[model samples]
Target chain A: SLAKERQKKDNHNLIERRRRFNINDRIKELGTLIPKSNDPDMRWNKGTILKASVDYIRKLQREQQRAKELENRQKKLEHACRHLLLRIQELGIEDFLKVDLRVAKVLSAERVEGSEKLLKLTLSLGDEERTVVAGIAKYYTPEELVGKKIVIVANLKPRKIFGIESQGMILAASDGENLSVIVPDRDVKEGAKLSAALE
Target chain B: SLAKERQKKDNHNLIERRRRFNINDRIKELGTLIPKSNDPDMRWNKGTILKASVDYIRKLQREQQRAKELENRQKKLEHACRHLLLRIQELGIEDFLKVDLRVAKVLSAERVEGSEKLLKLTLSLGDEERTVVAGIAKYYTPEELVGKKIVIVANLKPRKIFGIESQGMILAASDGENLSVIVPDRDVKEGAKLSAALE
Candidate 1:
């Protein structure tokens, strides 16, 4: 019984010692997080590590404040520019209102001969059909576009492209790499006009 | 002499107690820096404080990393958009090379009548004079621009802005807050063509 008690006491002592050792290890790791902690200029005892960390946090506060200011001003600049761009859009809406935009169903589509990006498409409005040329040959095959519903600029001035008169323009979006045609909801009617709040 | 020895021993004990008290105070303060340290569920002793602080520092490491990512991406997006705006100018330069940029001497400048922002400037382009209307009334007074060396889009398509025929365009840089004209070195000859590598 005495030997068993002795072994239990020894185990308790070892556990206590190990607890202290783990804390000391954590303290050492914490020291590494501080700036210049390994400068070798000062004794990096636990007390010193803790005090230095407080100072590091203070320094980080100063740095973060400056970055916050810079970030805020940059945001303000962006908002300012975006506001102006929106005003430019307002001005553009005058031109936008002039040009008619309508939903159209692609009746047929084919690649324009001798042209790289030109695709000749015939679109069907409810009342009539219009020919449009778009630069999306690489992005869409004729089979993909035919029978597809898309948006078009209907009042575009007729222009001869590759000797073929293009009466309208397909409304497509591009990010210098990917090109996508605008599609309305499947239930949307052909010749449905696209408008802003303005009629 | 025996009592004196006892007194000295008592004073030493007091001093040691005060030192320990100060350490305890620091430990308490450190606890405040930890997350959930004030939670009612856990004992907030010195060991808990220190361990919690270590975890707090680790948590801070993660939060700081995310903050750094957000800050960098915001900066990059700002730069990216600014670069595209500059490229829009490149596309505009298709219209821009059609533009003749030259260092011009402002012979005279006057605010366009009834216009809020238009400033009429007459530029001396070495061989001839050109009248340009620019939107800079708020930034520059007519007297401020007169006799100053400035850059201009010399061959900008002649248009009537504010009902005044603006023969060319003054080249100016602007931010949200400040607007400034581009100026060449005082020694630069007037009518010097501004060109990219294409020139």
Candidate 2:
């Protein structure tokens, strides 16, 4: 009976060793799929690889969301263009080409003290001036944005950000990596109505 | 001595419990970061989340590689354009404007038996037909490619793929998700030279 008990203990140890080896092999396979494993100077352990993989997946999801948004916007624009074209044939071009887009000049820009992405901007719309908060500080510096002419949604409901009331929203285009403000191609007077006919 | 042994056993059990708790907490955090973790119908266990995360990260890395390749290609094209412009100023435009990009008609397309992404294409280059391998099976079907006219790098070196000799490379543009073959705006004869001046 004593010999039988010793044999059982030895068998359990062998099974555990096999399980550990199998786990190590799986981890090695994972390392080969990861980018860091290709670099000779960088050594990533199992834990580090798993953690990095999780972070990279999150980043990918964010990028996918941005791309989906861009695609949706393009589809919406195309649909709007088609609708406008059809409507123009029935009801002249004048009725379908009405929107409240106006040119706004940036008077000053300052970063929100506690926020990394928010920049508080003062805009002069020729008729009146308003303060708006934009999440473009990561892409644009306050100095670079101070004198820039950017388009804004002037009719948006005022919202408070970082204890400051933002009167409007700035318009920016993003391709998931870069953010660019929408600006007029030629010099236009501030508060000038921006208009375009789809047809 | 008996009390010391009892305390040692208690400490070991406590340490094991803490380690188990920490691992569970990490898994919970990972689940929160993953998509659909908040869905009531979709319940993902720790093992499932870990496996899915690994797959998602690999997909992201592949997309990043594709984007990087596209950016590099654009950069190389711009550099070549600039170099050609300078060379034309020194020499005449007649010598610099010569190349062998031509339209090739696809005679037939068959999926490479063992490969998922590869399709073996028989292309008629007007004078001679050649067998080429293209990695566009995911975006294009064999039947769809049978009669299509696509641009090809006619003078590229022949290469062996899966023991089959590929005479030329087909030109296609990809944004990691969508792949589209470069076709002429109008109908062109097979083997018609595609030409453009940089200036």
Candidate 3:
């Protein structure tokens, strides 16, 4: 009886595996239909590439945490049920739509000589590169930030921050003290668009 | 003392509101600059009819739940230092690209005359329309599913299921007899993309 039971279990497992195999087979079939190209080798790296990947991932976890918090805040707001009566303003959706938000990979980073909490970062936005000075030195070391993907406002006109001509502001969420950049959910081509919506 | 405390609280609230207003102002400003059809009614909700809107919203919520789960899974996978091997072979560099997946509502559903567990469903994919035949009849009735935005594979290849061709697949997680569809963390547009990854 025990042997028979073991055999039955094995058979059940085989069925599950076959089902999985079938699903995977279909996925493979789909993959073949997509176009192909000899895209250039993804040659890009930022200050301490290895460390940046790790830090970037950690940053994503932290943002997800923040997002969860904001989500909870939203629930509370909805429970208060005031969105309907809050004098919702249209403010023209087109101006808002032109905002091309993107996630950029950090190619390099260096400490601003005089400022302790400032780091000059070279970011690769798939299509172009930009330099930005972020005030996150207190929390993240330059070594901990290279090669990380960060959400950047691609269309923002260049402006100077602490003497550096920062091309775009990195998108981040903060709760009084700690600040963290918004990272992509999965790996995507650099310069991928980050679309937004009104509340 | 009571007056002073109340005054402090009121001032704090005012600052919070102002902060929100400033953020919204920036969003509105950005939206105005983007070139798109400016018709308020035509702009956001174009293509999604009332019946379809409900289906699309419900679909989005389901995807959000999965995306959040996948995010969590990725975190856990990385933490455990497990190999990031996808069993589904349909993934590619392009597929790896982040696409904005959103919740969609199900506007209407009806069972085919002779099918035991097949139902023809007309769904509102937020900004698009889709039809799917789900094997959920063993558990759910079409009327019971009205207004539910079940998660959908918005980009899945349209295929024939049973005798009917299905435009997309609704996502659901199952554990033996237990099954549940993922819903969004909050209400969004009927076809509004869930995240900027899609842009």
Candidate 4:
């Protein structure tokens, strides 16, 4: 209750500052480029349909960028905690071969609309498309889920759930039912690799 | 005397904060790592020599980083301003395209030692090196200026003076005689082209 109340206050202050800063207008302007589908089954309809998609994508991009930044901050904090962690892991340094992180793009999404919080999605991870069921239906719709760039644990082992074969898990920040997928800050190529490990 | 007294007050306040923040000790630790050249003619002691070099390098790096951050902030501000500018520019596309801006790099610098002002700088614009005389000797020394990256105009013609052939000019900001060169926020390779025209 304390954390929720504090978060609510912070969000309120932030939204007010954002309004005063005219960031809302800028977000609205950028959102105009993405066209929106006028599906009869779609629940909410308020703002300009084109702008809605743009705003959604921008919000997703901002959240992803924030997560990556926080992850980097976490790495720095961890490095500061231990001196042994500061060793230079160079190429041919003879400890372990350098492992690179891969970026993937989401191609299509299938919402189990009858089910509360499951979205079956297909992601293009460079070589092939992989299916994944993520519990993010509360925050994202199936149509809105398409064409987002995501970071994948490419070396992860495949698993099965609900009689369906599931590939790699989508990285996200979750607080109980609220889920936000970890997306790339920019439009990276479907298989761009991050050079060095933060560790 | 009044200006010096005010500066002393500011310095004392900064020192107080440095002690409070434990930044002074961090700075002292950084001072312990410079190689000393055994030149008997050098007036400054060998211990202070390392401290001076460390201090100078740290100061330059901080200045460079601050300039870089300022550049990023300026970019965001300008981007926000561009929404308004675009409305104006869109009405006349040819006028928008006519405005030319380009990036260049600093190759070398020479400061007249006993003089309080002026440094002759050589900036590379594409294939050509342009000689530009600048009044930046107050804030920067010749040693600090050399091998630093900067942005310059590509098309400014030759202006000869004091028996030296001057080519294009270096772009910098000035508050009276105080001057600062505008360089890229991040390290870009030599001869990286910038454009005022749309990408």
Candidate 5:
């Protein structure tokens, strides 16, 4: 009976050692998997690996929350751009050709005397050069208008401004914040008539 | 002597139990710290707790990397929007006011004969009514344009379009893709002259 007790004691010690061996082996592998510099001095230390691994896990959770936020913001920006709609009453096909709108090359542009918003422009419409006046002095320089193809009411009746006759009128679109002189998207010929934009 | 030996054995047995008890206590705490369901039987299993904890740590590390990638993309989209600039020639106060632009309430609109884009509009200015034709037929219907206060060049001389005199001109902006008739953000009286808006 005493000999049997001795054998049982030895088996208990061996089992405890085996359990300790498994725990150490798993901890070693866990340390290797967490992000770190290739230094055995720190990686081999169990306490350092335990603390660093916990920090790494929490850091990942925080980042995941931020990623979701970024995703929502991106979706909002894309939606705003896609749904940029016109608030004005819509027009039709003949509405596109109604204006005697033409592309006119600027021959000359200068400030009209004593006028705060008048620019006297000489426009070359291929067959005829016409004089027109527009309000954009505060928004544009006279030099900028020269040589640029601009949109104009080409067949407008010649009208008098400050005693000088204006043969045509320039075009622009405005919002409360800014006003822009309308120009062709590309090189449109002088006196070229604009076409229906909608199919 | 026999009594002393029994006490010694009892103390040895207590110390061994204490060691086993400490190991189990630490493992239980470790299992609770890792994310888990509120269950006792599974948490009590040391082998299962160890495996689940390792998986949780690796999952967090993966999420951290994905967060960095999302942060970079968000920064890029913001940069692009902030840098939206005017590539065309930039415009001045006299330049802003030279045109006799006014807000005119649309009274009537109809298509001109044989024109694809022409829309004839009867506009009610405060002191006068004017007839104008614009190329917006492809984009808008006549019913949509009625009663909308629209911008126009008020002082332009009368001009012939399809044998009918057009006394003024309408305003819009386009880039060969779409056209929108210019309108005031708020209700302005008919004949409300638009002032130089420089921002």
Candidate 6:
């Protein structure tokens, strides 16, 4: 009976080893599917592949959401443009002009105390400085907003919000839930005049 | 000395347990970042999340590659179009464009015997049947291609490969190392005309 119990324990150990081996094999297969593994010069261990896979999937999801928003905005803007043209033709007013836009570099960002949704940002526009409050505090931290180039409606009338004077509105895109500030694809000088059409 | 050895063994067990606990915690953190975990109605175990994360990342990589290829091809086509217009302006020949593309459903697919890179496909083009030989065997299996609608160059001269007559060239996108057959985004009837501009 003691010999039989010893044999049973040996069999259990063999089964456990086989199970771990199979799991390792599956992990190797998954690693081969990851894009980073396609680089012949780089070797990715299981832990690195799993971690990178998680990060890569999250990045792709963000990109997909951004692309979907862009597509929706393009369609909406086209439809609005068509209606605007029809109204212009009906009213016979051909010259409906442009709005001035400028690029501003964020100089500093800080949260307004006791407010869950307000972030006060100090921005530099070449030779001048302006202060604005944005409702992106819930989505982004103050540190994440520093030293970024953001589009602004340069000629908007100043407004007072929460006892602070807001000089201009920072341009952002939203999909009802997520909000993202519009930034240039490449770095541009502060106070650079943005064209009416984003290139 | 025996008492000291027992204490050392106990400490080793404790260290092993802590190591395992840390790994499980990391796995849990990774699972939280996966999109499936964001669904309120579904509960995913650690193993399921790991497997799903791998698949999701692979799918995202494929989509990113496809989008990149589409963008590159669009840029190349637009550039060629501009050059063609310039050439036409210099030559005074205003019209030159004729290529036919047709959709064909792969009825069956099999690898050619003795060939590692050749797949013999039987295709139905609405009223007629044709056979094609494609070198996508390295990238796709026969079972994966069955009943898929693929674009064909329709009017290319028939050729013989591996002692079998090939009827048409199946369109594919390639990035030197990876090759993917171009298929309709949705189901299309066999022999449907594919627009030259890919409408």
Native contact fraction per model: 0.07, 0.12, 0.00, 0.00, 0.33, 0.12
Best by DockQ: 5
- Each candidate's chain B TM-score? 0.52, 0.51, 0.47, 0.45, 0.51, 0.50
- Preferred candidate (TM-score higher): 3 or 5: 5
State each model's CA lDDT, in order: 0.77, 0.75, 0.63, 0.60, 0.76, 0.75
- Residues B1-199 of candidate 3 have per-residue lDDT tens digits of 9999999999999998876665344324323332344365554321222213223334444545655765574456333322223333342433432333557788998888878867788889655588887777767788988888776766565688676889777777789877777777677667655432321
Docking class of 5: incorrect
lDDT of 6 by residue, A162-188 (tens): 899888888889899788998889887
Off by over 4 Å in 6: A1-19, A34-45, A81-199, B1-11, B37-43, B66-199
Question: Candidate 1's residue-wise lDDT over B119-199, tens digit each?
Answer: 888889999888888888887888986787898877666888777888888777876467999998656888898887462
Q: Is the docking of candidate 4 incorrect, acceptable, medium or high quality?
A: incorrect
Cα error of candidate 2 at position A59, Å: 17
Evaluate residue B143 in candidate 2 and report its C-alpha lDDT on the 0 to 100 scale: 96
Candidate 3 runs further than 4 Å off: A1-91, A197-199, B1-199
Task: Give lDDT tens digits, candidate 4, residues B62-81.
Answer: 44444454445555544555
Local lDDT at A76 for model 1 = 76
Question: What is the TM-score of each predicted model, taking all chains together?
Answer: 0.36, 0.35, 0.28, 0.25, 0.34, 0.32
- Alpha-carbon lDDT of model 2: 0.75
Candidate 5, DockQ score (0 to 1): 0.17
Query: Which order, best to worst by lDDT?
Result: 1, 5, 6, 2, 3, 4
